[PDB]
Design a protein around this motif. Structure first.
Motif, mmCIF file in Angstrom:
data_model
loop_
_atom_site.group_PDB
_atom_site.id
_atom_site.type_symbol
_atom_site.label_atom_id
_atom_site.label_comp_id
_atom_site.label_asym_id
_atom_site.label_seq_id
_atom_site.Cartn_x
_atom_site.Cartn_y
_atom_site.Cartn_z
ATOM 1 N N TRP A 196 40.680 -5.978 24.055
ATOM 2 C CA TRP A 196 42.189 -5.927 24.122
ATOM 3 C C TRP A 196 42.271 -6.064 25.716
ATOM 4 C CZ3 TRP A 196 43.784 -1.320 20.527
ATOM 5 C CH2 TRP A 196 43.569 -1.644 19.462
ATOM 6 N N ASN A 197 43.528 -6.648 26.237
ATOM 7 C CA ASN A 197 43.621 -6.547 27.606
ATOM 8 C C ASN A 197 44.156 -5.523 28.382
ATOM 9 O OD1 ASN A 197 45.387 -9.532 26.581
ATOM 10 N ND2 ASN A 197 43.716 -9.856 28.034
ATOM 11 N N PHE A 198 44.825 -4.612 28.184
ATOM 12 C CA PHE A 198 45.063 -3.247 28.644
ATOM 13 C C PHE A 198 45.274 -3.386 30.167
ATOM 14 C CE2 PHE A 198 43.182 -0.904 24.853
ATOM 15 C CZ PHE A 198 44.100 -0.088 24.781
ATOM 16 N N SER A 199 45.527 -4.482 30.737
ATOM 17 C CA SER A 199 46.466 -4.370 31.898
ATOM 18 C C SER A 199 45.396 -3.941 33.093
ATOM 19 C CB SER A 199 47.905 -3.897 31.598
ATOM 20 O OG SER A 199 48.396 -3.507 33.151
ATOM 21 N N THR A 200 44.513 -3.495 33.065
ATOM 22 C CA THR A 200 43.645 -2.959 33.943
ATOM 23 C C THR A 200 44.077 -1.851 34.674
ATOM 24 O OG1 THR A 200 42.649 -5.089 34.337
ATOM 25 C CG2 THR A 200 42.640 -3.897 36.190
ATOM 26 N N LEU A 201 45.328 -1.213 34.432
ATOM 27 C CA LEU A 201 46.063 0.010 35.066
ATOM 28 C C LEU A 201 46.027 0.923 33.671
ATOM 29 C CD1 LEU A 201 47.218 1.927 36.914
ATOM 30 C CD2 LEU A 201 49.146 0.937 36.381
ATOM 31 N N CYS A 202 46.351 0.428 32.614
ATOM 32 C CA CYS A 202 46.180 1.235 31.478
ATOM 33 C C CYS A 202 44.643 1.982 31.204
ATOM 34 C CB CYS A 202 46.822 0.715 30.203
ATOM 35 S SG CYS A 202 46.821 1.758 28.623
ATOM 36 N N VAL A 203 43.560 0.946 31.639
ATOM 37 C CA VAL A 203 42.236 1.469 31.415
ATOM 38 C C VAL A 203 42.069 2.379 32.423
ATOM 39 C CG1 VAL A 203 40.038 0.584 32.167
ATOM 40 C CG2 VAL A 203 41.265 -0.799 30.535
ATOM 41 N N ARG A 204 42.459 2.359 33.840
ATOM 42 C CA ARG A 204 42.480 3.366 34.716
ATOM 43 C C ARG A 204 43.128 4.729 34.581
ATOM 44 N NH1 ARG A 204 39.211 0.332 35.625
ATOM 45 N NH2 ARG A 204 38.600 -0.872 37.362
ATOM 46 N N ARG A 205 44.019 4.868 33.859
ATOM 47 C CA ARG A 205 44.704 5.908 33.676
ATOM 48 C C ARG A 205 44.254 6.633 32.434
ATOM 49 N NH1 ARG A 205 50.967 4.211 33.522
ATOM 50 N NH2 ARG A 205 50.125 4.093 35.782
ATOM 51 N N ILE A 206 43.670 5.689 31.289
ATOM 52 C CA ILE A 206 43.344 6.417 30.273
ATOM 53 C C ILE A 206 41.684 7.014 30.583
ATOM 54 C CG2 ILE A 206 41.812 5.642 28.081
ATOM 55 C CD1 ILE A 206 44.676 6.270 27.438
ATOM 56 N N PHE A 207 40.956 6.343 31.417
ATOM 57 C CA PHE A 207 39.491 7.007 31.600
ATOM 58 C C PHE A 207 39.937 8.157 32.718
ATOM 59 C CE2 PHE A 207 35.900 4.468 30.450
ATOM 60 C CZ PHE A 207 36.555 3.641 29.421
#
Length: 427
Positions: free
Chosen positions: A295-306
């Motif tokens: 999924w794309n996840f915007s590369t910031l949603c990945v950061r804040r999820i992790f």
């Protein structure tokens, strides 16, 4: 092997020794203080200062380290940082007899020497690592830090158990000196200064860096980086390092005074947390790109999820380990799970500087590390002030403070961080 991979295998061992010389005091101090070697009558607050004095020098030379590396090259800076740390470590059994003052001075000078080693290796890879290969080389060279933390604890335990605590410092000092000899003999600053490099390998490295060295428009000017997308990284890194450094300096003390573990078991079971953290930050690097490609996840949603994972997992399982106190098995299990989950921050805030403003990686890394060393200076002292003897309630207070700080840092990062290249960053 190659010249660049020889450099990455010698940097691996250099950082192994850096972090071993940093961490061996955490386990030696368990054996140095009195309720065979010599034993000293240091109270609670004194051991806090002795454990936190390293970071008083560590904070000083991280930002000046990059400047001095761009001045005199990274080889001599890294070699002399590690040689200074090793030769000073050889003097810890002598510095302890002179008093607490000379011990914290020696340990702060070790910090001064060690702070200047990551900027030096960054400067070396700036001219040694081809762009398509920079990740692999940097990872091989910096995995030595994780391995050094993982192995310095069982070794310190074994040495303190079968010999004195002094042989910890003797062993690690002489290993640092032998590495310095190897490093000075085998390594050079630049492929052009290397003596045993090949025609084709040097040509390949130079052509790989050829016009990317032309693309360096970010050199002559840096703006005012006082932007809250960067203070988010700074606050997250501070909150992470509070727990990290508190546990890194006071896990053997906890496992001796609360869980009542032998020195050998102390080291062996204090190494499991950081082994788990290493494996977790290895696997999270792949989980993050799968999450960003599947999924794309915007590369910031990945950061804040992790970052949410790697900063609230540690908090939850730290309060769990504090609550379950005096139960050796569950306490060690939860102390492993917390700092294991703390490895998701490797794809959380730890690389948000590489996408909030790339081409400023050195400056931003220096800033965040300088501000995140303060937990190393104050955390051990606060935790030794709160826990005069053991009083499981007091260690519970310490764990609750560290957990509240992790939660605050995760909230602050998830609210204010950004994932795009910032305005002031575009050349």
């Amino acid at each position: 092997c190659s010249a660049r991979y020889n450099l990455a295998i010698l940097a691996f061992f250099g950082f192994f020794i850096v972090y071993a010389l940093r961490v061996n005091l955490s386990v030696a101090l368990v054996d140095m203080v009195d309720s065979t070697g010599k034993k000293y009558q240091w109270d609670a607050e004194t051991q806090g200062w002795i454990l936190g004095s390293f970071f008083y020098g560590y904070i000083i030379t991280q930002i000046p380290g990059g400047y001095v590396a761009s001045k005199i090259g990274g080889k001599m800076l890294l070699g002399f940082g590690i040689l200074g740390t090793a030769v000073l470590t050889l003097f810890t059994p002598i510095a302890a007899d002179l008093g607490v003052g000379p011990l914290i001075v020696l340990r702060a000078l070790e910090g001064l020497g060690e702070g200047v080693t990551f900027p030096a290796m960054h400067a070396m890879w700036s001219s040694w690592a081809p762009p398509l290969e920079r990740s692999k080389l940097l990872s091989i060279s910096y995995a030595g830090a994780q391995l050094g933390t993982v192995i310095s604890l069982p070794l310190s335990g074994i040495i303190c158990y079968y010999m004195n605590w002094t042989y910890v410092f003797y062993f690690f000092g002489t290993i640092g000196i032998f590495w310095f000899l190897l490093w000075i003999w085998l390594v050079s600053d630049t492929p052009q200064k290397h003596k045993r490099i090949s025609h084709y390998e040097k040509e390949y490295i130079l052509s790989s860096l050829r016009n990317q060295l032309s693309s360096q428009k970010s050199v002559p000017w840096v703006p005012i980086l006082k932007s809250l997308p960067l203070w988010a990284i700074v606050v997250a890194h501070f909150s992470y390092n509070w727990t990290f450094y508190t546990l890194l300096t006071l896990l053997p003390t906890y496992m001796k005074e609360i869980l009542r573990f032998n020195v050998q078991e102390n080291g062996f079971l204090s190494s499991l947390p950081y082994l788990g953290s290493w494996l977790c930050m290895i696997l999270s690097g792949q989980a993050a790109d799968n999450l960003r490609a599947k999924w794309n996840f915007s590369t910031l949603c990945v950061r804040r999820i992790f970052s949410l994972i790697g900063m609230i997992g540690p908090a939850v399982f730290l309060v769990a380990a504090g609550f379950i106190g005096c139960d050796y098995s569950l306490a060690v299990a939860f102390l492993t799970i917390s700092t294991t989950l703390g490895g998701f921050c490797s794809s959380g805030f730890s690389i948000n500087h590489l996408d909030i403003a790339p081409s400023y990686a050195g400056i931003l890394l220096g800033i965040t590390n300088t501000f995140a060393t303060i937990p190393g200076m104050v955390g051990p002292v606060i935790a030794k002030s709160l826990t005069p003897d053991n009083t499981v309630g007091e260690w519970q207070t310490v764990f609750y403070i560290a957990a509240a700080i992790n939660v605050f840092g995760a909230i602050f990062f998830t609210l204010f961080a950004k994932g795009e290249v910032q305005n002031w960053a575009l050349n």
